[model samples]
Target: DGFVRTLRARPEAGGKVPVFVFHPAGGSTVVYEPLLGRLPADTPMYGFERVEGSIEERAQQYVPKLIEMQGDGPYVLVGWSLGGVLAYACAIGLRRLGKDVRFVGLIDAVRAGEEIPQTKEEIRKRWDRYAAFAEKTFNVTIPAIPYEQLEELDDEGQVRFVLDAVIPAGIIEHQRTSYLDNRAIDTAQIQPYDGHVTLYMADRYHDDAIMFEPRYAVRQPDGGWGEYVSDLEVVPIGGEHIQAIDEPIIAKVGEHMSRALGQIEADRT
Candidate 1:
């Protein structure tokens, strides 16, 4: 049964443009749950879930499986953070097999050229600062939402989140893992990709302001993926990184997807 992965049915049941989404390590497919109804009715959304701590393993087998199972259809890879890096690799692998890859969207994906801040000293230094915020925000006694937001979460808000199936511990772990390890996703090695590349930037976390800035990342100095791969565009949407996963934001992302699919479909016509 563990091998069987169950998920909500996607609305785009028959479309050739399938959004292949990959999630951050500490996350489950639940992160993309909000995307279900928003995609165009014809697009099938295929999800790839791995058993815990199996990213490298999944990568080894995923490419061949993708080609064997899904060959030559319109594909879009949407990955968030680490997920973005994985998506990039998977997309490239699929491309080598001649699959119809249309788009690769990176939401706050790490720039390969950017140095991954590691080292016990560096981690300790970062954790120390985070500790102060974590104390006022997250400690053993702290819940996931920053203590600052505690004031904003009244009983009604608490009940709303609870009913909505919000799990504090899972969210906290996700943040911790994201901050602690940078190697979980390394864009530095992604082969040059030339196709539709969409990059989403998150200005800062937990900021209420929307309109995050966008820098064309695929062409960066560290973009080892190299130049001359394909068309790349940076789209600036408003919101902190994690904020874009919210329902309304997913709908907006869905619209972006639908419009792109229309273009792809039009070309074939």
Candidate 2:
């Protein structure tokens, strides 16, 4: 079993329905812990590491285990970033194999044709603006601290802690790999992910972002997961690209998803 790496089983209503999660690139199972206590308590969530170095190579890393595992379930999925890409794939596979998945979600994720700009210089310049946003926005949330100082984090607060330590590098590297390795996503073979599909998008820099409206930015040319599928939800939470993760991600995300799960169950019946 390629999933020979200890695949966990958790009970969703009486341990029967299982929910699985996948992490973003260069991250681990730790990502799911944020939403752990936040998701439905009875819903058991499982996270799998992306063995492949980059998202494009996921087929090589995942296909083997996928073929080997014979599954039975009432299932659901949550994928973040690159893991979100694989999450859609996994949900489709499970549905085809007769697993009943109530909901499938890709949080602030990439979808086919959602191109990340290819220029490194452009990538650097653009993210710098976002860095500034994090700095200013975080100051009020964080305690008495030096405005420009990133190194003095111990004296700083949680908001500053994230601004200084976590946010910048992630914005840069995350964009780099996305543009460099996997620009065009492949969801053609997928049948609109079978279950409900949700995209938690931030109204931020897109191909030609400002000219068009935000969540409706999907209207821009070659924008997003192609023509929206029937079961799709594109929820726009305010805040810039990176900051949006902090807000709508934690406070309001689960409810919309819970409702979607209900719809999926309704559709199935």
Candidate 3:
């Protein structure tokens, strides 16, 4: 009835910790469906659906739902892209409430406040990258709008222009709306978390440079999240940003996550 959706069900649970996954900017669990088959069948998994708000507000909202579903400590949280940011925020909130967050998995999630292209020239370059990513991922040609026209619009207008193009090209309506709503979320106030973070990094940027920003591409070893997390474990997964979570490659991601969770489970006992 709420935002929590059961991705995998283990009715007995068998003392296994249930995993709670946050949704990406698109706000759908469809991307994570493939991963469910990769995990251990005995492990229960839940996914959060779309909710509108800042990262902090969204985390606060989800934490209660999470507790209501599981009703205890030793939680496992995982997210991809924007969902990773939300997972980190939720982990922090849960700890503040004296809950034990056993694991935090961040899949190709970059930190906030990194340098984004502001100049029109740079913006145009970035747009080209987005176009290329969409074309390759969706296998549809996105008609290019003139840079002269794009440069004239404000930030919101430019974003709308991008959305308008993608939505028509088969991006779902809810996903497009969620992308717009999540664009301006501020994570500046999020303090450095004291827990350990397991970062699943895409080994390469491939052609989707927009998914792997400059800060993540070359700036920090921890994908610019080292400062925010106390202990960070980075595990390289084969694929580009989107590809890492897709077929063939997602198998590796699932393996690594399952192994990490197994280790956590072993250590707890």
Candidate 4:
């Protein structure tokens, strides 16, 4: 069952629905710690993380467990960064399997043909940017490992280095694999999904961020959200991309999420 561990657990609310959260590009749900508590109590949230595998494989492995754990369909999805895309993929699989999917909430998530790195150089640069973001946001210094030094290590050794200085030791091992092996993303494998998506945008990076403006949306044949997503609604919140994970700002994300959940229930009524 390639299942990773659950990130959060609260007592079940009798009438409350579960909103499953997907991790960001960092591949960790730890960042969402602050915002989870702010959601409506009627909403019991769970964090779903990526283990080592392709996007399609991960969806196949996780969706059934999601169905079993939550029981039945019309499930709600909440994703951040790459986690957003992964949630979309799960929704796509869920619907095809005859399950009903209600709402999908994406927090600064990028869509296909949007913000993916086109070349090795771009990927390398993104690596640097992530390192900087983590250091600044977490207020931790990462021990600089040169490319040449990285090359000398075995895959296991590389992951060890990642554990030592790159990210938290608690980060799922497979997620660590994603950053080191550059195998975390396979955007081309993303199929067209026709569900409506609720997007949360951080105003700090505002635009040009891989998850901002142009990259933030799903486009259609008519240059919209593509042939897949039928609708998209964006909610802008304060703070920079990394900074948004902290307080006050994160509260806004919670507010919008609760509102979206509320709207979904209202529609059912």
Candidate 5:
């Protein structure tokens, strides 16, 4: 149940490269629904449903399954938020296995050196910001609890609080568990990937990004996520990071993705 899942199952156009989208920590392939219709009709697209595991486990589990469905590189991988980092890991694994990774797309995805909160208190603060952003962006009110009260919660209690209070009701239990477990892994060390990345940046969210400050982040030799990716294509699509996948803005993101896919298709021929 926790593995790569297809969101859209359009018949593959002959010679078309099937694009696989990665899920954000709190999201699934459903997150890409808005942008999917915006892409070329014949472009085969699938989504990797995040499961609970280490990054290595996720990559190992995801890449092989991807190969099973698509049959090999050059594969087009797109990720949003935490999925972005996982996509890089998948690309690295694909490359290691001699598969040709054509293009890696990141929708406001955090990079290898971005500071992830190690302490639970730090995580809670970050969560507050995220919940606030979601509330304003989606116009859905998330119940707020004081930091002092949140601090009183154990790890499990905190997760339950988020599931019950912060996230909208009706989120299936597994999805809730997956979100919390995947988030815990984000604080763990992630390997660097030396590859080209096309980053769909939500520039509007920079002020409220809620990630750790640059001073606290792990510094890459080349500086600011650039070194982690050899050739970076940073396309600023206006929206908050979390809201970038939602409509209006997703249309722009879809346009950019369609163009990238077109170029990739062109290059393949």
Candidate 6:
């Protein structure tokens, strides 16, 4: 009924801890639909939609609802992109409340405080990548705008201009604006968290950009999450950033998650 959506119901989960997933910037649980079937049938799963606030504020908001749903320790958290940052923040909040967070899974989310592109040339290159991704995914060509004209507008204005051009093609949904807004939040405010993280990285890099910057231009062994997380495991899955939760690739993510859950479950015994 709230921002939380029940992806999979396991009322009789026995001693199995439920898996809570945070939604990407789009603020919709629909992105996780492909993963529902990939997880174990008996594992309880939940998804949290994006709310209006900073990363820490949003995590604080979700903590109570999370405890209300499970009311105990040993919870599993997972997210992709911005959702991964949300999951990490929520983990910190939960642990501060004397709750035990068993696992944190980050799916292609860059660590907070990483350098973001600010120059016009960088932004243009990033925008070109987004246009290419959109065209390939939606099967519609985005009309070209002069770079000289785009330079006059601010960052947000440029994003809106791109959206304005693409929205008419009926490619993007309404939630994308909110997604863009959420992108501006400086997640670096959230402090480093002490926890074990499993990073399901999209191995194939195709110049994926977020907020007018290349996401993985410089590769880190831990997918750039090592800076924020204490212990990290990088599991490379075959796919692009946007398609991590899509078919075929999601299967690999599901397998790794299921394996992690099994280990967490075994520790309980």
Residues 1-269, model 4: lDDT tens digits? 24444545546544556778877665467677787777876466678765545677778877888888776755988776667767888888898888878888777553433545545555445456667777888998866636565555544465676666534545565466555323344343556777777777665343444422234334322222345555767777745556666688878888877887787677766
Listed in order, each prediction's TM-score against the native is: 0.63, 0.55, 0.73, 0.66, 0.71, 0.74
Write model 3 residue lDDT over 1-269, tens digit each, in one string.
47877887657646677888888766576688887778776778888977765677778799898777766678889888777888888899898988888889888775533655457887688678777877898998877657887998765577677556533445556645654544533232446889988988876554434463444454355777777787989988756777766778778878988897888778878
What are the RMSDs of all candidates, in order?
Answer: 10.2, 11.1, 5.5, 7.1, 6.5, 5.4
Residues 137-241 of candidate 5 have per-residue lDDT tens digits of 899877664667667775556677765653435655665665564554455455666667788776543443334233223323332457466687877776566
Residue range 1-269, candidate 6, lDDT tens digits = 67888887757647467889888765577788788678777788889986765666777799999898877778799888778888888888888888899899888775423555557886677668767878888998878847887887765566677666533433354545554544543224546778888888875445535334444455566766666676888888856777887898899899888888888888988
lDDT of each: 0.56, 0.51, 0.73, 0.64, 0.71, 0.74
Whole-structure CA lDDT of model 3: 0.73
Best by TM-score: 6
Q: In model 5, where is the ten-residue run with the lowest total lDDT?
A: 214-223
Task: Supply the TM-score for candidate 1.
Answer: 0.63
- Flag regions of model 1 displaced more than 4 Å: 1-15, 51-57, 110-114, 117-183, 186-188, 206-230
Which stretches in model 2 have alpha-carbon errors above 4 Å?
A: 1-13, 53-70, 111-194, 205-223, 244-248, 261-269
Q: Indicate the residue-level lDDT of 85 in model 2.
A: 73
Which of candidates 4 and 5 is the stronger one according to lDDT?
Answer: 5
- Can you list the residue pairs that collide in candidate 3? none
Comparing 1 and 5 on TM-score, the stronger one: 5
Candidate 4 clashing pairs?
A: 74-100, 193-228, 194-228, 218-225, 219-224, 219-225, 219-226, 220-224, 220-225, 220-226
Task: Between candidates 1 and 3, name the one with more favorable TM-score.
Answer: 3
Model 1: per-residue Cα lDDT over 117-226, one tens digit each: 43444434433444455466545442344333334453334334434533577675564554322334531345677677877655444432111112222234323233
Model with the higher lDDT, candidate 5 or 6: 6
